[PDB]
């Protein structure tokens, strides 16, 4: 009867993710335990004898509820625990790079439904370079920004990195963000000036 505890949620999607917790407490292991999903207008409860589950068919940005409840035998019930669980943006798609004239590159992407905002990460590959942390993307908006110069201190993207220098090659990684604060899985792309 004893709540579980140490819960954790393990993504591998946007649209599925595992529940893994443990219980123990005295009585060894040997019990059996009950999970609640809320996605409303449906009330849905699993039951498993091994304490994780495999939770599928969630959406992307929301956040669902979740509780799980041990117990052992019948009506031999223990108690509920609930668990906050916020599912990854879908990554960002039709991930392009466009270089207009050695000194300058554009790159665009499409977003997606569920994102908010996105996060790119430049950094410069070989030198005796750089590696800036451009925060704060917005879907539908245009930037141009000199990534060299923030080293010291539809629903698309457009942002094109000037003053670059030539010779060297760059990775730009690309995190989709929610409202929610969780980043989906990145996707990179690469362009050499
Ligand atoms: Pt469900």
Same mark, same amino acid.
């Given at each position: 009867?004893?709540? /579980?505890?140490?819960?954790?949620?393990?993504?591998?999607?946007?649209?599925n993710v595992? @529940?893994?917790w443990?219980?123990?407490?005295?009585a060894?292991?040997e019990?059996?335990?009950?999970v609640?999903?809320?996605?409303? +207008? %449906?009330?849905?409860?699993?039951?498993?004898?091994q304490?994780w589950?495999?939770?599928?068919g969630?959406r992307?940005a929301?956040?669902?509820?979740?509780?799980?409840?041990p117990?052992?035998?019948?009506?031999?019930?223990?108690?509920?625990?609930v668990i906050?669980?916020?599912?990854?943006?879908?990554?960002?798609s039709? @991930?392009?790079?466009?270089?207009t004239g050695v000194?300058?590159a554009?790159?665009?992407?499409? +977003?997606?439904n569920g994102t908010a905002?996105c996060?790119?990460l @430049? %950094?410069?590959?070989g030198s005796?370079?750089?590696?800036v942390?451009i925060?704060?993307?917005?879907?539908?908006?245009?930037? +141009?920004?000199?990534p060299?110069?923030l080293?010291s201190?539809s629903?698309?993207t457009?942002?094109?990195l /000037?003053? @670059? %220098?030539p010779?060297t090659?760059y990775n730009?990684t690309?995190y989709?963000?929610a409202?929610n604060?969780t980043e989906?899985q990145?996707?990179a792309?690469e362009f050499?000036t």
């Amino acid at each position: 009867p004893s709540p /579980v505890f140490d819960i954790k949620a393990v993504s591998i999607s946007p649209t599925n993710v595992i @529940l893994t917790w443990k219980s123990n407490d005295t009585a060894a292991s040997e019990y059996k335990y009950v999970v609640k999903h809320k996605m409303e +207008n %449906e009330k849905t409860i699993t039951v498993v004898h091994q304490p994780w589950c495999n939770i599928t068919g969630l959406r992307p940005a929301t956040s669902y509820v979740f509780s799980i409840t041990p117990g052992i035998g019948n009506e031999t019930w223990g108690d509920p625990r609930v668990i906050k669980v916020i599912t990854e943006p879908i990554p960002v798609s039709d @991930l392009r790079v466009a270089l207009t004239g050695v000194r300058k590159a554009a790159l665009s992407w499409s +977003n997606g439904n569920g994102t908010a905002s996105c996060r790119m990460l @430049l %950094e410069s590959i070989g030198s005796h370079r750089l590696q800036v942390n451009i925060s704060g993307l917005k879907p539908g908006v245009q930037y +141009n920004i000199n990534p060299y110069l923030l080293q010291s201190n539809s629903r698309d993207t457009e942002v094109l990195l /000037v003053g @670059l %220098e030539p010779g060297t090659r760059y990775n730009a990684t690309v995190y989709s963000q929610a409202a929610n604060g969780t980043e989906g899985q990145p996707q990179a792309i690469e362009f050499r000036t």
